[PDB]
Design a protein around this ligand. Structure first.
Ligand SMILES: Nc1ncnc2c1ncn2[C@H]1C[C@H](O)[C@@H](COP(=O)(O)OP(=O)(O)OP(=O)(O)O)O1
Ligand SMILES: [Mg+2]
Length: 440
DNA sequence: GGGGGAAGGACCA
DNA sequence: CCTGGTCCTTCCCCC
């Protein structure tokens, strides 16, 4: 929940319910929850078994760990995270003035991808189904999305970000972390004319602090596109995205560099607000009485010893308010994917056709990167939202519609047999290549 | 006990 | 009446 707080959780939750109480959807959730509740046992059972001297041991390992992490804590880097405001919604607003002063969302009667801050006041939020959305906000306008138009604006803004961290990394069409560390240096000595801007004595000049560059950045981005950004300044990434959001929309927040500011901040930060901690992790941790970063730190004894090697590691890094100061080389596609939702299809002949066209879709997108891949998964969601998923891998490499349909076909084939003499009643079918070629 | 491969999930925009 | 990606953790089965 990030955008508009101060909401009538009462009326809004009743309404969200009515349109769910008996919905096929609700069912799968309602019993996906049983799985969450019973996983908690596994953990609480594995706690009861934990002994005193065990924890005593578990400690020193961890404490040590905390130590050098703390000795290696880096604060010379100034990391910024730019996050756009109601991004798709904000573009659409811009492009079609008729929508200026109206609650909108970008999406579909089945699901909203985002919504303007206006609509947000009614309770409409991203990941919400439109049909529910319009029960909270009768006058909500649902624009269909047009990604080629959003890519348009992402590119546009990046032409700015270039000028500051020409090696920034961008998380999405709407987010990028930057590192002004370098820029701020040169920027100490710019004259004011290197920093004066015209505002569409009507003209302004930005000073020389990090707080002042992110001011300037957000300015230029607003002046170019009419869209606003919130931005979060800190000395690593984790802290940055959390800051970006502490003054949305149109605003910015700085944790200055030193152990305290970070601690000052970290102390009562509800664990949920960190990237990568979600509905579930929260419910688990919260089940151990962990709610705030601090509570997380001081539970570290138990967590290292109850969770996976990589998880408690992560947990701990947050405990101390540690992230990453180096922005990484572009990356590499690990997969490509295409899936689609539809009214029930329980006639096999159709299921196969749908697949063919999905594979056809995929292969084309694939061609556009001139990439070839040697594994393949179908996804297939029952009309109860229960979801199976089947993989396969060739030895050579696959690349086009037909050839990669030859695998999809047989992957499905078995799953029809498997449930035969029943048809697969379906809502969602999907298909994705994986694998890759590198140098050699 | 590794590691490559399939089945599932968590969490992210 | 609920919409492309990554990166894990469990089994598996090869060695
Ligand atoms: N669940 C989703 N499905 C499809 N598209 C999404 C989804 N969530 C987010 N997006 C797209 C639309 C969002 O505008 C965009 C950026 O995400 P995010 O920054 O979380 O929201 P936002 O920029 O629209 O609002 P905010 O002002 O809170 O940032 O990514
Ligand atoms: Mg989070």
């Amino acid at each position: 929940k990030a955008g508009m707080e101060g909401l009538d959780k009462e009326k809004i939750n009743k309404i969200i319910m009515e349109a769910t109480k008996g919905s096929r959807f609700y069912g799968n959730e309602l019993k996906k929850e049983k799985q969450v509740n019973q996983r908690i046992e596994n953990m609480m059972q594995q706690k009861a078994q934990i002994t005193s001297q065990q924890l005593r041991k578990a400690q020193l390992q961890v404490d040590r760990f905390a130590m050098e992490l703390e000795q290696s804590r880096n604060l010379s880097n100034t990391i910024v995270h730019i996050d756009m405001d109601a991004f798709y919604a904000a573009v659409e607003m811009r492009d079609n003035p008729e929508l200026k002063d109206k609650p909108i969302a970008v999406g579909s009667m089945s699901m909203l991808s985002t919504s303007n801050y206006h609509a947000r006041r009614f309770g409409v939020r991203a990941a919400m189904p439109g049909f529910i959305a319009k029960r909270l906000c009768p006058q909500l306008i649902i624009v269909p999305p047009n990604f080629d138009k959003y890519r348009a604006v992402s590119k546009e803004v990046k032409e700015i970000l270039a000028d500051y961290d020409p090696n920034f990394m961008a998380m999405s069409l709407d987010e990028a972390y930057l590192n002004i560390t370098k820029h701020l240096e040169e920027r100490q000595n710019w004259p004011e004319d290197k920093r004066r801007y015209f505002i569409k004595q009507n003209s302004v000049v930005f000073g020389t602090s990090a707080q002042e560059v992110v001011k300037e950045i957000r300015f230029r981005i607003e002046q170019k596109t009419t869209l606003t950004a919130s931005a979060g300044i800190a000395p690593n990434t984790m802290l940055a995205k959390v800051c970006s959001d502490k003054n949305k929309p149109n605003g910015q927040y700085q944790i200055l560099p030193n152990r305290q500011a970070v601690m000052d901040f970290i102390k009562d930060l509800p664990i949920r607000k960190v990237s990568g901690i979600g509905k579930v992790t929260e419910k688990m941790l919260k089940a151990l009485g962990i709610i705030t970063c601090t509570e997380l730190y001081q539970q570290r004894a138990l967590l290292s010893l109850l969770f996976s090697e990589t998880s408690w590691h992560y947990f701990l890094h947050i405990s101390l308010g540690l992230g990453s100061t180096h922005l990484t080389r572009d990356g590499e596609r690990k997969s490509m994917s295409v899936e689609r939702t539809f009214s029930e299809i329980n006639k096999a002949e159709e299921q196969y056709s749908l697949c063919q066209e999905l594979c056809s879709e995929l292969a084309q997108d694939l061609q556009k990167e001139r990439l070839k891949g040697r594994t393949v998964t179908i996804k297939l969601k029952n009309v109860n939202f229960e979801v199976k998923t089947r993989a396969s891998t060739v030895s050579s490499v696959v690349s086009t519609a037909e050839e990669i349909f030859a695998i999809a076909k047989e992957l499905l084939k078995t799953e029809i047999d498997a449930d035969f003499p029943h048809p697969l009643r379906l809502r969602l079918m999907g298909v994705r290549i994986s694998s890759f070629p590198n140098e050699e």
